[PDB]
Design an enzyme around this catalytic site. Structure first.
Site, PDB file in Angstrom:
ATOM      1  N   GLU A  46      -0.004   9.967   1.591  1.00  0.00           N
ATOM      2  CA  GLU A  46      -0.029  10.082  -0.058  1.00  0.00           C
ATOM      3  C   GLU A  46      -0.798   9.444  -1.145  1.00  0.00           C
ATOM      4  O   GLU A  46      -1.163   8.717  -0.449  1.00  0.00           O
ATOM      5  CB  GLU A  46       1.644   9.028  -0.660  1.00  0.00           C
ATOM      6  CG  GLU A  46       2.596   8.951  -2.460  1.00  0.00           C
ATOM      7  CD  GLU A  46       2.928   8.043  -2.386  1.00  0.00           C
ATOM      8  OE1 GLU A  46       3.156   8.043  -3.944  1.00  0.00           O
ATOM      9  OE2 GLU A  46       3.143   7.058  -1.895  1.00  0.00           O
ATOM     10  N   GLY A  71       1.067  -1.094   0.274  1.00  0.00           N
ATOM     11  CA  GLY A  71       0.229  -0.019   0.042  1.00  0.00           C
ATOM     12  C   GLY A  71       1.050   1.095  -0.024  1.00  0.00           C
ATOM     13  O   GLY A  71       2.243   1.650   0.163  1.00  0.00           O
ATOM     14  N   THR A  72       0.088   2.655   0.132  1.00  0.00           N
ATOM     15  CA  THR A  72       0.922   3.848  -0.099  1.00  0.00           C
ATOM     16  C   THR A  72       1.375   4.208   1.141  1.00  0.00           C
ATOM     17  O   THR A  72       1.345   3.344   2.732  1.00  0.00           O
ATOM     18  CB  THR A  72       0.107   4.906  -0.080  1.00  0.00           C
ATOM     19  OG1 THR A  72      -0.334   5.086  -2.025  1.00  0.00           O
ATOM     20  CG2 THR A  72      -0.337   6.037   0.475  1.00  0.00           C
ATOM     21  N   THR A  73       2.300   5.098   1.218  1.00  0.00           N
ATOM     22  CA  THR A  73       3.164   5.346   2.407  1.00  0.00           C
ATOM     23  C   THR A  73       2.898   6.290   3.424  1.00  0.00           C
ATOM     24  O   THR A  73       1.980   7.404   2.202  1.00  0.00           O
ATOM     25  CB  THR A  73       4.837   5.888   1.852  1.00  0.00           C
ATOM     26  OG1 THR A  73       5.169   5.850   3.042  1.00  0.00           O
ATOM     27  CG2 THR A  73       4.740   6.800   1.177  1.00  0.00           C
ATOM     28  N   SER A  96      -1.951   2.037   5.802  1.00  0.00           N
ATOM     29  CA  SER A  96      -1.755   2.100   4.882  1.00  0.00           C
ATOM     30  C   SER A  96      -1.747   0.125   4.667  1.00  0.00           C
ATOM     31  O   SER A  96      -2.615  -0.099   5.499  1.00  0.00           O
ATOM     32  CB  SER A  96      -0.158   2.008   4.587  1.00  0.00           C
ATOM     33  OG  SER A  96       0.203   3.656   5.025  1.00  0.00           O
TER      34      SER A  96
END
Lengths: 140, 233
Positions: free
Chosen positions: A47, A30-32, A75
């Site tokens: 993000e 996943g996204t940070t 995340s």
């Protein structure tokens, strides 16, 4: 033998829970997102991958508020993160109803902690595919 | 089925050209005993709504908590909680009106008479009543309990119908409200001299006034009244 990773609550020979470790792989994918503790508060940042120009800017909000003093960012599997915040909001409301004062952050931390740990005790439930960064300002 | 223990008396309200005015005294009566004097019975929700509650105080404090949770719940996953998707006076009333009727249908009512006073997003004046029975109505002037008998007749002299609303200024409306509070102090035995007054205007916003007192009272004529019929001295 093998197959220790097919069911949730099953211990592997080395005392590990593989289904939980596989949920971590969903988080890493996943996204940070980050959290910074400062001298009198906390700051959350995330993000937001713009898949296409068709995504309306500033609309798809990821950071969520619990009560009126706690902020949550996560995340991995976004739907799983929303479910955890939904529980956290119920948990915060339950504290304020009985104790009048808004829920302390260490108090709120355990409430989410016990709920996520509960999803590692049974084979009929799936572990959360999210790592959640959260916090706020309380009494001290 | 319950019975009211600690009670609050009249809540009076009217609408003028630019907004609404609402008032209630700071008393918490325990039967005939005037027990508590620091009770706020006007509850501001946001900056566009004030909720005036009479009757059972423990039930009022429950409604207080419900309104504070409604603010908390509305801000959840809502980036426009302070703008387009803010709590309207109409949303606040309809929620309470739903609760009041649900409680009476379960035979366990909230022993209250509630007036929701505010201004809508388009500038329209909002003034609606709801009680323990779930009975709802709107009028240019609204008053609960004892004020319905005494304040209403006085406030309707200023605004008798809908067309009188744009003709009424804040100065005239507030004067009529302050006068009505004095009359209620004269004839209501469960009333206090100290009261709160709230003005919700479409231009100046919310104006909350605390620790107001009934002034300019006529008592001098009492010295001339002696006996109950035939006594001269």
């Amino acid at each position: 033998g093998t197959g220790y990773d097919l069911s949730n609550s099953v211990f592997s020979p080395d005392g590990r829970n593989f289904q939980v470790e596989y949920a971590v792989k969903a988080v890493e994918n996943g996204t940070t997102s980050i959290g910074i503790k400062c001298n009198d508060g906390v700051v959350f940042a995330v993000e937001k991958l713009i898949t296409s120009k068709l995504l309306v800017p500033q609309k798809n909000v990821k950071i969520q508020v619990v009560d009126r003093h706690i902020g949550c960012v996560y995340s991995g599997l976004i739907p799983d993160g929303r479910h955890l915040v939904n529980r956290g909001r119920e948990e915060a409301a339950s504290f304020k109803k009985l104790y009048k004062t808004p829920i302390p952050i260490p108090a709120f931390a355990d409430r989410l902690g016990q709920y996520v740990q509960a999803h590692t005790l049974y084979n009929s439930v799936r572990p959360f595919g999210v790592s959640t960064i959260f916090g706020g300002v309380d009494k001290n | 089925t319950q019975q009211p223990i600690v009670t609050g008396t009249s809540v009076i309200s009217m609408k003028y050209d630019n907004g609404v005015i609402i008032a209630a005294d700071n008393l918490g009566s325990y039967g005939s005993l005037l027990r508590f004097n620091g009770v706020e019975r006007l509850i501001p929700v946001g900056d566009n709504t004030v909720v005036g509650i009479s009757g059972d105080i423990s039930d009022m404090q429950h409604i207080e908590r419900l309104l504070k949770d409604l603010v908390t719940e509305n801000a959840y996953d809502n980036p426009l909680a302070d703008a387009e998707e803010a709590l309207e006076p109409s949303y606040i009333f309809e929620y309470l009106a739903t609760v009041m009727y649900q409680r009476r249908s379960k035979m366990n009512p909230l022993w209250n008479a509630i007036i929701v006073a505010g201004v809508q997003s388009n500038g329209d004046q909002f003034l609606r009543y709801v009680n323990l029975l779930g009975v709802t109505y709107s009028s240019p002037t609204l008053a609960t309990g004892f004020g319905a008998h005494m304040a209403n007749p006085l406030l309707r002299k200023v605004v008798d119908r809908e067309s009188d609303i744009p003709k009424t200024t804040v100065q005239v409306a507030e004067e009529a409200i302050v006068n009505a509070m004095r009359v209620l102090y004269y004839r209501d035995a469960r009333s206090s001299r100290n009261f709160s007054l709230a003005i919700i205007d479409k231009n100046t916003g919310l104006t909350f006034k605390k620790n107001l007192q009934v002034e300019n009272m006529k008592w001098d004529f009492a010295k001339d009244i002696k006996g109950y019929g035939t006594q001269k001295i």
